[PDB]
Design an enzyme around this catalytic site. Structure first.
Site, mmCIF file in Angstrom:
data_model
loop_
_atom_site.group_PDB
_atom_site.id
_atom_site.type_symbol
_atom_site.label_atom_id
_atom_site.label_comp_id
_atom_site.label_asym_id
_atom_site.label_seq_id
_atom_site.Cartn_x
_atom_site.Cartn_y
_atom_site.Cartn_z
ATOM 1 N N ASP A 21 0.800 -1.223 0.000
ATOM 2 C CA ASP A 21 0.000 0.000 0.000
ATOM 3 C C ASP A 21 0.835 1.277 0.000
ATOM 4 O O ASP A 21 0.296 2.357 0.268
ATOM 5 C CB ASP A 21 -0.981 0.037 1.179
ATOM 6 C CG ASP A 21 -1.857 -1.197 1.244
ATOM 7 O OD1 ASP A 21 -2.061 -1.839 0.192
ATOM 8 O OD2 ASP A 21 -2.346 -1.524 2.346
ATOM 9 N N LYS A 24 3.585 1.222 -4.549
ATOM 10 C CA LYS A 24 4.623 0.600 -5.365
ATOM 11 C C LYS A 24 4.063 0.122 -6.699
ATOM 12 O O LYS A 24 4.582 0.471 -7.766
ATOM 13 C CB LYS A 24 5.255 -0.551 -4.577
ATOM 14 C CG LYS A 24 6.250 -1.403 -5.339
ATOM 15 C CD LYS A 24 5.620 -2.733 -5.719
ATOM 16 C CE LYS A 24 5.363 -3.582 -4.482
ATOM 17 N NZ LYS A 24 4.703 -4.874 -4.811
ATOM 18 N N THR A 25 2.984 -0.662 -6.660
ATOM 19 C CA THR A 25 2.314 -1.045 -7.898
ATOM 20 C C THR A 25 1.642 0.154 -8.558
ATOM 21 O O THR A 25 1.602 0.242 -9.792
ATOM 22 C CB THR A 25 1.293 -2.149 -7.629
ATOM 23 O OG1 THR A 25 0.420 -1.747 -6.565
ATOM 24 C CG2 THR A 25 1.996 -3.442 -7.240
ATOM 25 N N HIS A 84 6.710 -8.363 0.628
ATOM 26 C CA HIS A 84 6.323 -8.953 1.900
ATOM 27 C C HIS A 84 6.857 -10.376 2.029
ATOM 28 O O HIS A 84 7.220 -11.023 1.042
ATOM 29 C CB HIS A 84 4.796 -8.947 2.057
ATOM 30 C CG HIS A 84 4.324 -9.381 3.411
ATOM 31 N ND1 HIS A 84 3.944 -10.676 3.687
ATOM 32 C CD2 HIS A 84 4.180 -8.693 4.568
ATOM 33 C CE1 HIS A 84 3.583 -10.768 4.954
ATOM 34 N NE2 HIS A 84 3.717 -9.576 5.511
#
Lengths: 393, 67, 203, 80, 77
Positions: A21, A24-25, A84
């Site tokens: 969140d 990054k994407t 992650h």
RNA sequence: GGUCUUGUAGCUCAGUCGGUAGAGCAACGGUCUGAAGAACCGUGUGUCGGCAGUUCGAUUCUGCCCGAGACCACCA
RNA sequence: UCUGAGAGUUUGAUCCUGGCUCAGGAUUAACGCUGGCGGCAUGCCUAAUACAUGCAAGUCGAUCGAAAGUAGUAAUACUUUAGAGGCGAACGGGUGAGUAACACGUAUCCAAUCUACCUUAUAAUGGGGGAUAACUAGUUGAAAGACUAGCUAAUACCGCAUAAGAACUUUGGUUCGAAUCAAAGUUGAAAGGACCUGCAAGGGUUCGUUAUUUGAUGAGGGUGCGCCAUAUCAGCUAGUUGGUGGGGUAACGGCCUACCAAGGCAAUGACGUGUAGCUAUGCUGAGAAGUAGAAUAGCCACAAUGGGACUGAGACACGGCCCAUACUCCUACGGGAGGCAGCAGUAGGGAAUUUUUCACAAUGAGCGAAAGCUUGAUGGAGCAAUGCCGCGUGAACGAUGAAGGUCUUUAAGAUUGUAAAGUUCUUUUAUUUGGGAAGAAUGACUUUAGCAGGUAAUGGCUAGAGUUUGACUGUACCAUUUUGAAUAAGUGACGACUAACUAUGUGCCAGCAGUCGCGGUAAUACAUAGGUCGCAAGCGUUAUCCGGAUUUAUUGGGCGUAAAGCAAGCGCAGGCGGAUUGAAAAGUCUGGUGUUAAAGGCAGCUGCUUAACAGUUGUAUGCAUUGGAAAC
């Protein structure tokens, strides 16, 4: 002829590593989207970022996401990396064959140890002079705290030995740029301009036989196995028989097609990202992690000896000693290979912060060079990144 | 792969079978054990035959030692 | 090996004769018994007919360094005509190129002649040849390839070669031609043709 | 033809249109050596005239071969 | 799919139309001959039969057979 | 391509939430039929994968990973 | 002028009967060590399971109209043909699911059929009409697609006379339903282009274009015969066998129909359950024969499954069409597209298979007045020790024995072994320096001299010359040309069968085994070490077919006690059977024409260095067949 192309400008690999969140994407999509408006088209929608199960409903990537585009200065290839745990096996591969380190931070959440792990990842592969962006500032207003956050980021990078003052930090937000606001598209353009400098050019060599670490393989209906990796020393053109060494017995095979992520190329410069189609190979022997090269390549090795400079407490690692039964993990940019550690004599226990050259006993015969960059990792973190100094078996 | 449960004898160094593993067989009868006419092919699969054995080094599949 | 290497070893156990006198080389009294550890008692205690047929076949096989498959081909060729099997078998035996090259006195051993043929320094019908298994007939040219006359081996061979009457050539001219056919007693009579011929019921 | 690789031999026949090559043939009409320099073309010269009068399609090399054998010379007189 | 036979299909559509148009002429003419027996109608039948016999429409053997049987049944008069 | 579980005697298995090596085949000395086998009596055969931390020592709490054993590679 | 080997195995030991295993030879074989090469062949048998992408059947401007463009100063040489017309796509390609029969191979019949090309020859190629696309414009549909109005001529289409010879009736002649000249009446032909002599006309030459004349090609039916096993499958079959009237095929026929008669096959194996493409042939053997139907070829078959027809003379058509199916997809959710058993490649299965490789340069096909392309037919290069065949890993000398392994373990002894050191020697493959032939001297096309009929040419026969036609292509092969013993062997077994034995460990553990079986610690067989042998860039075990197995016994067994005579008899057919005379014609032998394809064998040659192999020449197995030969 799926795609004819001959690059007129050098190829550069760019990537991103961020916590969940952070945007990054979002930034990954936004940079290509805004470059699909002024420069050459990229055709980068939200559907060309994630494909694996359970990753579309979460917004994070399991494996690297591949985009590629031209620019006025350097031809870039953008690879998206996970952030992650429970998927670190894939983020290591995604971020270990890059040539840049882009850090995404936000003013909506304070810097968390995942940023420290991002600096760690930049530290292992040895990528100095990063480009950091205070992206995603389209949340509840902050007046002067953002400058303090930027200062904290600048003196945060000294924990790993990286410069903080000369980092081209610029205000901006990518989500509003993807929403349709040209004002933040200008901020993303400023981020690109900062990216244009301080990023090391991918390593290039034109005379070595070949060497490429496997990352994954893709099946194409009617063609076969498309290998994922990076031609990083030497070169490879069509019609050259190639050997396979590492993690498996040597196997002689023939190359048939040279893809460049759904393109066709005559010859590719070292360090670039492309693909190679093999003849009559089997995926049980062709597995993620091994090496393919040209006859006369580096000899496979099962046992060897390497120096080490264990990371300090300040450098992100742990601070507790290791016994002689030590069996940590090793990463040659591709795959988790387990190995035993044997400690020099006249010393019982060594902790991260002190170092003696250690002999590594790998599980499988891995084709390794003398001086190879290999990361020693356990417990979901890094304690060091060393280099091979001697071969015994 | 065909549906027929058959017995096999286990030559080679002890056993190299692990409770529903994959194997490859060879023909051949034995007088001592009635109800079995099959052998395992040591060397070409999870079973690999070599340690302190160099005579008849065609069965018990193994590599040639190097000086 | 294709070339046995040692010839003395085989002549130990089998009692094989290659040249004028090989049973006793005066080499410190070489044994006629089998080499190694068991040249003590197994001399004649367990002889059966199939055995003698077998080492007679082996001795016949090792006079020319001929392998089994090519001899089977030669026996096929022999069976490709009629008549006494012994005469045709022997005739096709000498007819091999390296054998005539050796018999001329241009090479002191069949192996040197075969090596010269393979290396291409032997000529047939005014054209170089490189096969040591040629079948020959009347009117077949053989030269010395004068570049290969300074050899220390061929010089001594020409000086003191073995004289053969079935093929006539002038030793000091080094030019030969196949002339006629041999006689049975001329060939070594120690070889029994019956055993070697009729052990080969294969083809 | 049913010769050998890198050294074939061709047997000539004036076969009809629909019939497959190197398969079943209407007749055997000699052969030729198209690899060495002797011009050896063994022919029978006993049924070719009858087949030509009865209907026969000449192929490309037929012209040269039957000009060398002189059959085309007598063909014009056989037509009359 | 071959780009060399669709034109043949478009051709044989009109060919089949013409063949039907000519065959039905024979059909109607033989109907007339079977209904009323004379020489003129059967002569017209023969004319049309030979015209379509020359054309590659119906085998001329069939036309000969039909004309032979028609004259055979006409032989009553 | 990541998912769940397992790794404990020579074998199959047990199973304090941090203070347990528990059972059956197997091995050993024998009773004994003439001897074998069986039974009976004796009494012992486990770093409880391989490492680093949490902690009071963690086999048993975690983390990487070594293997393996089933499942899933759906939307041209 | 051919022409075969046995051995072990039960019992105290034998003589039996008899049951098996082994010594070979082939292949579409996998596995371990292996890895040198050459030339030649072979390489989905398993899932007739679906398969992305590109190719695998295309062609003609001297057929027509017309459109785009090049350029020539606007008229227009010229290219593409976007389309209608010409042929082919029906053959070639592949694979055997199905098929137990006219499916296959032959002897043979059409007295009932066919056939464009290609060759013998006549008659014409004359005169008219109509529409017709592409186009242009418009509608509709998301696209695929359907249409709505003008346009032009086409070797496309339909009339008119043309018509001897042709198709069908009337008389005189004729062969075991057939063959012919007449006399009439009904009828049926079309298309021009190009090239020239020639005032155009008039005329020719050529490609064609129509109906008759021999021809071939291929297809199609009744054939005699032969064709897998199985009576622990006994009856089977009603348009199904027969009679007739109409059709229907190129044609005879329950092929079909309408009306009448109950038949036909089957013990001398129908009907049926199953397997399987048949044949030439691959292989075992002395043969009768067995076996596999590799590839390669002749023939039948279907194109995911079924159907249903159409154009062409020929398909029920591998990349033609209409539809129902199962599946994969597009879809703006109305409707659409699809068939790798064509070559490569991919998924799955299986131990198990070639490269999304290249060229029309040789033949064969498709077209034409031609270069021209189509030629995944074919021709090649790469991969595969899969199966053969053939050459290396050295050569002459050198030792009363170099060490070290092994053995006696006395060693003051046998081995390894002239194996090595050393001398030069030549590099087949390496190495590198040069030439690059070669299938292709075949092949069109352009000019020089006469011969076909008119010569005025074009045009058909030639002879000669000619530039040009190479993927393999630095090839194999040579150059005493550069260096160099160099750049390169294992393998199974060693008690007997079955040439090849000694020590150590191990103690009914570990194991071997094709059989006696070997291990109760002194194992020539378990495992090593040494030695030995068999074979060899191939080697032993497994999967298989035969041989030895005279173990299906006609050729070449038996039935008293070893397995075996029905408990006997009366006893149809069926196999036999005293002697002669004469005719005989089914066997038996002499005769050739058709074949029996070719290839494959058998022998002789030719060639690649001989061989492998390829080609060449003849060689035979079986039925017609017309004479005859006279005992059985």
């Amino acid at each position: 002829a799926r795609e004819k192309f001959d690059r007129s400008k050098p190829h550069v690999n760019v990537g991103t590593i961020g916590h969940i969140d952070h945007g990054k994407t979002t930034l990954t999509a936004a940079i290509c989207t805004v470059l699909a408006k002024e420069g050459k088209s990229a055709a980068t929608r939200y559907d060309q970022i994630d494909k694996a199960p359970e990753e579309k409903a979460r917004g994070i990537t399991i494996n690297s996401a591949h985009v590629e585009y031209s620019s006025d200065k350097r031809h870039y290839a953008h690879v998206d990396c996970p952030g992650h745990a429970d998927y670190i096996k894939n983020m290591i591969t995604g971020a270990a064959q890059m040539d840049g380190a882009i850090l995404v931070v936000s003013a909506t959440d304070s810097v968390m140890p995942q940023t420290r792990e991002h600096i760690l990842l930049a530290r292992q592969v040895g990528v100095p002079r990063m480009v950091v962006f205070l992206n995603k500032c389209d949340i509840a207003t902050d007046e002067e705290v953002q400058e303090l956050v930027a200062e904290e980021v600048r003196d945060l990078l000294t924990s790993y030995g990286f410069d903080g003052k000369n980092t081209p930090i610029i205000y901006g937000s990518a989500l509003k740029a993807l929403e349709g606001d040209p004002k933040w598209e200008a901020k993303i353009h400023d981020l690109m301009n900062a990216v244009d400098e301080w990023i090391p050019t991918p390593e290039r060599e034109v005379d070595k036989p070949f060497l490429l670490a496997i990352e994954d393989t893709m099946t194409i209906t009617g063609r076969g196995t498309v290998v994922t990796g990076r031609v990083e020393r030497g070169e490879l053109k069509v019609g050259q028989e190639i050997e396979i060494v590492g993690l498996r017995p040597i196997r002689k095979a023939v190359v048939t097609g040279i893809e460049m992520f759904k393109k066709e190329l005559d010859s590719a410069m070292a360090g670039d990202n492309a693909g190679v189609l093999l003849r009559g190979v089997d995926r049980k022997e062709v597995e993620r992690g091994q090496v393919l090269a040209k006859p006369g390549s580096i000899k496979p090795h099962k046992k060897f000896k390497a120096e080490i400079y264990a990371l300090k407490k300040e450098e992100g690692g742990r601070h507790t000693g290791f016994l002689n039964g030590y069996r940590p993990q090793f990463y040659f940019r591709t795959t988790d290979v387990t190995g035993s550690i044997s400690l020099p004599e006249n010393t019982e226990m060594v902790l991260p912060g002190d170092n003696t050259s250690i002999t590594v006993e790998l599980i499988a015969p891995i084709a390794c060079e003398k001086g190879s960059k290999f990361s020693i990792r356990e417990g979901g973190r890094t304690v060091g990144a060393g280099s091979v100094t001697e071969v015994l078996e | 792969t065909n549906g027929f449960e058959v017995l096999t004898y286990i030559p080679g160094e002890g056993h190299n079978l692990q409770e529903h593993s994959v194997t490859l067989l060879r023909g051949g009868r034995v007088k001592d054990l009635p109800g079995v006419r099959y052998h395992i092919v040591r060397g070409t699969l999870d079973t690999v035959g070599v340690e302190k054995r160099r005579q008849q080094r065609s069965a018990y599949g193994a590599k040639k030692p190097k000086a | 090996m294709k070339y046995t290497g040692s010839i003395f070893k085989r002549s130990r156990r089998l009692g094989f004769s290659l040249l004028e006198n090989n049973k006793e080389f005066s080499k410190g009294k070489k044994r006629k018994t089998i080499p190694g550890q068991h040249g003590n008692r197994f001399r004649s205690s367990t002889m059966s007919g199939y055995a003698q047929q077998l080492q007679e076949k082996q001795r016949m096989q090792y006079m020319y360094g001929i392998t089994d498959k090519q001899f089977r081909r030669l026996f096929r060729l022999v069976l490709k005509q009629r008549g006494n099997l012994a005469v045709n078998l022997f005739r096709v035996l000498e007819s091999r190129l390296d054998n005539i090259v050796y018999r001329m006195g241009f090479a002191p051993t069949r192996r040197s002649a075969r090596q010269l043929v393979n290396h291409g320094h032997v000529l047939l019908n005014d054209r170089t040849v490189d096969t040591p298994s040629i079948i020959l007939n009347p009117g077949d040219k053989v030269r010395l390839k004068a570049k290969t006359i300074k050899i220390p081996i061929v010089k001594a061979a020409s000086e003191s070669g073995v004289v053969s009457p079935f093929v006539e050539t002038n030793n000091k001219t080094f030019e030969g031609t196949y002339v006629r056919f041999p006689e049975r007693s001329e060939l070594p009579a120690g070889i029994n043709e019956s055993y070697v011929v009729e052990w080969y019921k294969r083809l | 033809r049913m010769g050998r690789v890198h050294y074939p031999t061709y047997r000539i026949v004036a076969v009809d249109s629909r019939v497959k090559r190197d398969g079943k043939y209407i007749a055997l009409i000699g052969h030729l050596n198209p690899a060495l320099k002797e011009n050896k073309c063994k022919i029978d010269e006993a049924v070719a005239l009858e087949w030509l009068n009865k209907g026969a399609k000449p192929t490309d090399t037929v012209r040269s071969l039957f000009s060398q054998t002189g059959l085309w010379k007598k063909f014009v007189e056989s037509k009359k | 799919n071959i780009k060399s036979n669709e034109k043949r299909l478009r051709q044989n559509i009109k060919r089949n139309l013409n063949n039907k148009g000519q065959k039905t002429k024979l059909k109607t003419n033989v109907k007339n001959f079977h209904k009323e027996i004379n020489l003129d109608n059967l002569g017209n039948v023969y004319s049309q039969a030979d015209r379509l016999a020359r054309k590659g429409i119906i085998s001329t053997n069939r036309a000969r057979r039909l004309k032979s049987r028609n004259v055979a049944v006409l032989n009553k008069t």
